Amino acid sequence: DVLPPEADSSIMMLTSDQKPDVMYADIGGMDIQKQEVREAVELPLTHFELYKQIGIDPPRGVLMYGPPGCGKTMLAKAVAHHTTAAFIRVVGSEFVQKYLGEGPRMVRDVFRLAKENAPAIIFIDEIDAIATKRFDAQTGADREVQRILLELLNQMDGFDQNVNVKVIMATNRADTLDPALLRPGRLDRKIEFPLPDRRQKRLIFSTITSKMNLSEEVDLEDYVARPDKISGADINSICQESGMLAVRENRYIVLAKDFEKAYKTVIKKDEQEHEFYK
Amino acid sequence: DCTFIRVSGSELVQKFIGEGARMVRELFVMAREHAPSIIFMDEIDSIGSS
Amino acid sequence: LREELQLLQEQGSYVGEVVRAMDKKKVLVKVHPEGKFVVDVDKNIDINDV
Amino acid sequence: EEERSKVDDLRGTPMSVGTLEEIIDDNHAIVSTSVGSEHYVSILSFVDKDLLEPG
Amino acid sequence: TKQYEKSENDLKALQSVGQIVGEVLKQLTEEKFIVKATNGPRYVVGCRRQLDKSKLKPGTRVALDMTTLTIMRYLPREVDPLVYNMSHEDPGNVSYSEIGGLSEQIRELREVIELPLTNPELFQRVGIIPPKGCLLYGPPGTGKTLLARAVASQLDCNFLKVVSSSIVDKYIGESARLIREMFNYARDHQPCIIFMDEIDAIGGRRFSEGTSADREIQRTLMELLNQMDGFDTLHRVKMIMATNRPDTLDPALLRPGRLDRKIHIDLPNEQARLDILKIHAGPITKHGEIDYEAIVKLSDGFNGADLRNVCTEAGMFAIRADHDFVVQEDFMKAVRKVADSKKLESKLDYKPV
Amino acid sequence: IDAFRLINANMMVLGHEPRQTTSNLGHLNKPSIQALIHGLNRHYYSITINYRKNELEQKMLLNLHKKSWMEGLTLQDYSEHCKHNESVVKEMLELAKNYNKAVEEEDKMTPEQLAIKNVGKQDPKRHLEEHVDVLMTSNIVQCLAAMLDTVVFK
Amino acid sequence: THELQAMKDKIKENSEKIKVNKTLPYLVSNVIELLDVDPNDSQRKGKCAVIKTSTRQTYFLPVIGLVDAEKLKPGDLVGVNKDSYLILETLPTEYDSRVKAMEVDERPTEQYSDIGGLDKQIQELVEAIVLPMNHKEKFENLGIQPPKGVLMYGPPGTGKTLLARACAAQTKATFLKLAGPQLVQMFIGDGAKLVRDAFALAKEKAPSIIFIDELDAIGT
Amino acid sequence: APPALWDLAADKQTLQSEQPLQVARCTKIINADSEDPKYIINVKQFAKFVVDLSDQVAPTDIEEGMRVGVDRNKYQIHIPLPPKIDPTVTMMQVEEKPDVTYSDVGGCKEQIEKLREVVETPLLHPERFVNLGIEPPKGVLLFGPPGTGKTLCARAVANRTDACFIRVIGSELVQKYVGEGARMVREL
Ligand SMILES: Nc1ncnc2c1ncn2[C@@H]1O[C@H](COP(=O)(O)OP(=O)(O)OP(=O)(O)O)[C@@H](O)[C@H]1O
Ligand SMILES: Nc1ncnc2c1ncn2[C@@H]1O[C@H](COP(=O)(O)OP(=O)(O)OP(=O)(O)O)[C@@H](O)[C@H]1O
Ligand SMILES: Nc1ncnc2c1ncn2[C@@H]1O[C@H](COP(=O)(O)OP(=O)(O)OP(=O)(O)O)[C@@H](O)[C@H]1O
Of F33, A139, E74, whose CA–CA distance to G48 is shortest? E74
Any known ligand binding at A66? yes
CB contact under 8 A, A143 and B15: yes
Per residue, the 3-state secondary structure of chain E, as one string, reads CHHHHHHHHHHHHHCCCCEEEEEEEEECCCCCEEEEECCCCEEEECECCCCCHHHHCCCCEEEECCCCCCEEEECCCCCCCHHHHCCCCCCCCHHHHHCCCCHHHHHHHHHHHHHHHHCCHHHHHHCCCCCCCEEEECCCCCCHHHHHHHHHHHHCCCEEEECHHHCCCCCCCCHHHHHHHHHHHHHHCCCCEEEECCHHHHCCCCCCCCCCHHHHHHHHHHHHHHHHCCCCCCCCCEEEECCCCCCCCHHHHHCCCCCCEEEECCCCCHHHHHHHHHHHHCCCCCCCCCCCHHHHHHCCCCCHHHHHHHHHHHHHHHHHHCCCCCCHHHHHHHHHHHHHHHHHCCCCCCCCC
Angstrom distance (rounded) from CA H187 to CA G124: 37
B42 residue type, one letter: D
Closest ligand to the CA of G112: 3
Question: Does the CB atom of residue E116 touch ligand 2 within 6 A?
Answer: no
Number of other residues whose CB lies within 10 A of the CB of residue A237 = 21
Residue G52's Cα: distance from chain center in Å? 21
Query: What H or E segment, with its residue span, contains residue H124?
Result: helix H110-124
Contacts of H178 in chain E (CB under 8 A): 211
Helices G119-134 and G160-171 cross at an angle (nearest 10°) of: 30
Distance E143 CA to ligand 2 centre (A): 4
Q: Residues near F65 by Cβ (< 8 Å), separated by ≥ 6?
A: none
Question: Does the CB atom of residue E257 touch ligand 1 within 6 A?
Answer: yes
Angstrom distance (rounded) from CA A179 to CA A153: 13
Cα A47 to Cα A39, A54, A110, A118, distances in angstroms: 11, 12, 23, 13
How many CA atoms does the CB half-sphere of E108 hold within 13 Å? 16
User: In chain H, what is the straight-line distance between the N-terminal and C-terminal CA atoms, in Å?
Assistant: 41
Helices F76-84 and F131-151 cross at an angle (nearest 10°) of: 120
CB contact under 8 A, A126 and E261: no
Angstrom distance (rounded) from CA H33 to CA H39: 5
Method of determination is cryo-EM
Number of other residues whose CB lies within 10 A of the CB of residue B27 = 21
Q: What region does G171 belong to: left with phi over 0, alpha with psi -120 to 50, or beta? A: alpha
Number of other residues whose CB lies within 10 A of the CB of residue A205 = 18
Residue nearest to atom 1 of ligand 3 (CA): G158
CB contact under 8 A, B10 and A143: no
At G61, is the secondary structure helix, strand, or coil?
A: strand
Q: Is chain B adjacent to chain A, meaning 3+ CB pairs within 8 angstroms?
A: yes
Angstrom distance (rounded) from CA G78 to CA G76: 5
In a 10 Å sphere around its CB, with 0-12 CB exposed, 13-18 middle and 19+ buried, how is residue A54 labelled? exposed
Residue nearest to atom 24 of ligand 3 (CA): G161
In a 10 Å sphere around its CB, with 0-12 CB exposed, 13-18 middle and 19+ buried, how is residue H35 labelled? exposed
Query: What H or E segment, with its residue span, contains residue H39?
Result: strand H39-43
* Minimum-distance ligand 1 atom for the alpha carbon of E257: 29
Question: Does the CB atom of residue A69 touch ligand 1 within 6 A?
Answer: yes
Phi and psi dihedrals of E344, rounded to 5?
-60, -35
Contacts of E87 in chain G (CB under 8 A): 73
A78 residue type, one letter: A
E325 residue type, one letter: F
Maximum CA pair distance of chain E?
87
Contacts of C2 in chain F (CB under 8 A): 31
Closest ligand to the CA of G215: 3
Question: Does the CB atom of residue E243 touch ligand 2 within 6 A?
Answer: no
Q: What region does A35 belong to: left with phi over 0, alpha with psi -120 to 50, or beta? A: alpha
Q: Residues near A233 by Cβ (< 8 Å), separated by ≥ 6?
A: A68, A69, A196, A227
Q: Which residue of B has its CA nearest to A177?
A: B10
The resolution of the experimental structure, rounded to one decimal in Å, is: 4.4
Q: Residues near A241 by Cβ (< 8 Å), separated by ≥ 6?
A: A262, A265, A266, E256, E260
Contact between H115 and H102 under an 8 Å Cβ cutoff? The reply is no
Angstrom distance (rounded) from CA G36 to CA A159: 48
Beta strands in A92-229 (DSSP E): 120-125, 167-170, 190-192
Angstrom distance (rounded) from CA G87 to CA G72: 13
Cα G86 to Cα A136, E100, F77, G125, distances in angstroms: 39, 54, 59, 53
Cα E334 to Cα E295, E340, F127, G125, G146, distances in angstroms: 11, 10, 95, 17, 15
Q: Which residue of G has its CA nearest to E314?
A: G144
Residue nearest to atom 18 of ligand 2 (CA): E143
Angstrom distance (rounded) from CA B21 to CA B14: 9
Contact between E210 and A176 under an 8 Å Cβ cutoff? The reply is no
Distance from CA of G106 to the nearest CA of E (A): 31
Helices then strands, counting H and E runs in chain C, come out as 1, 3
Apex G148 CA angle, G142 and G152, nearest 5: 125
CB contact under 8 A, H11 and D55: no
Query: What H or E segment, with its residue span, contains residue B13?
Result: helix B13-16
Any known ligand binding at H170? no
Angstrom distance (rounded) from CA E124 to CA E128: 7
Q: Which residue of E has its CA nearest to A239?
A: E128
Angstrom distance (rounded) from CA E278 to CA E288: 15
How long is chain H?
188
Q: Residues near H63 by Cβ (< 8 Å), separated by ≥ 6?
A: none
Helices F89-107 and F131-151 cross at an angle (nearest 10°) of: 150
Q: Which residue of A has its CA nearest to B10?
A: A178
E61 residue type, one letter: R
Of E197, E99, E198, E191, whose CA–CA distance to E150 is shortest? E99
Q: What is the dihedral of CA A147, A151, A156, A161, to 10 degrees?
A: 130
Cis status, amide bond into G93, omega within 30 of 0: yes
Distance E211 CA to ligand 2 centre (A): 35
> Does H95 contact chain G (CB < 8 Å)?
no
Residue A262's Cα: distance from chain center in Å? 27
Angstrom distance (rounded) from CA E54 to CA E60: 12
Of A126, A86, A79, whose CA–CA distance to A109 is shortest? A86
> Which chains are within 8 Å of A by 3+ CB pairs?
B, E
What is residue C37's DSSP assignment? E
> Which chains are within 8 Å of D by 3+ CB pairs?
C, H
E198 residue type, one letter: E
> Does G57 contact chain E (CB < 8 Å)?
yes
Contact between A203 and A33 under an 8 Å Cβ cutoff? The reply is no
Of E218, E224, E93, whose CA–CA distance to E152 is shortest? E93
Residue nearest to atom 1 of ligand 2 (CA): E99
CB contact under 8 A, G28 and H180: no
E70 residue type, one letter: T
Angstrom distance (rounded) from CA H3 to CA G210: 61
Exposure string of F82-120, with b = 16+ CB inside 10 Å and e = fewer, is bebbeeebeeeeeebeebeeebeeebeeeeeeeeeeeee
Angstrom distance (rounded) from CA E284 to CA G139: 10
Number of other residues whose CB lies within 10 A of the CB of residue E271 = 10
Of H81, H32, H83, H29, whose CA–CA distance to H57 is shortest? H81
Distance from CA of E17 to the nearest CA of H (A): 20
Cα H107 to Cα E267, F49, H28, H144, distances in angstroms: 70, 105, 55, 17
- Smallest Cβ distance to D12: which of C35, C36, C40? C40
> Does B45 contact chain A (CB < 8 Å)?
no
Of A234, A146, A172, whose CA–CA distance to E260 is shortest? A234
Looking at the DSSP bridge assignments, the partners of residue E239 are E194
> Does C21 contact chain D (CB < 8 Å)?
no
Helices H151-159 and H110-124 cross at an angle (nearest 10°) of: 30
* Minimum-distance ligand 3 atom for the alpha carbon of G116: 3
Question: Does the CB atom of residue E305 touch ligand 2 within 6 A?
Answer: yes
Q: What is the dihedral of CA E197, E198, E200, E202, to 10 degrees?
A: -70
CB contact under 8 A, H17 and D42: yes
Of G128, G181, G169, whose CA–CA distance to G151 is shortest? G128
* Minimum-distance ligand 3 atom for the alpha carbon of G214: 26
Angstrom distance (rounded) from CA E238 to CA E252: 18
Question: Does the CB atom of residue E308 touch ligand 2 within 6 A?
Answer: yes
Angstrom distance (rounded) from CA H168 to CA H93: 6
What count of CB pairs under 8 Å joins A to E?
136
- Smallest Cβ distance to G28: which of H30, H40, H75? H40
Cα H121 to Cα H63, H97, H130, H161, distances in angstroms: 36, 20, 12, 10
Helices A198-211 and A235-246 cross at an angle (nearest 10°) of: 30
Cα H14 to Cα D34, H2, H4, H10, H64, distances in angstroms: 26, 19, 15, 6, 34
Angstrom distance (rounded) from CA F144 to CA F78: 8
At G68, is the secondary structure helix, strand, or coil?
A: coil
Angstrom distance (rounded) from CA A102 to CA A122: 19
Cα A225 to Cα A11, A194, B19, F93, distances in angstroms: 47, 19, 59, 72
Residue nearest to atom 25 of ligand 3 (CA): G156
At B3, is the secondary structure helix, strand, or coil?
A: strand
Contacts of A209 in chain E (CB under 8 A): none
Any known ligand binding at A55? no
Contact between E83 and E160 under an 8 Å Cβ cutoff? The reply is no
At F78, is the secondary structure helix, strand, or coil?
A: helix
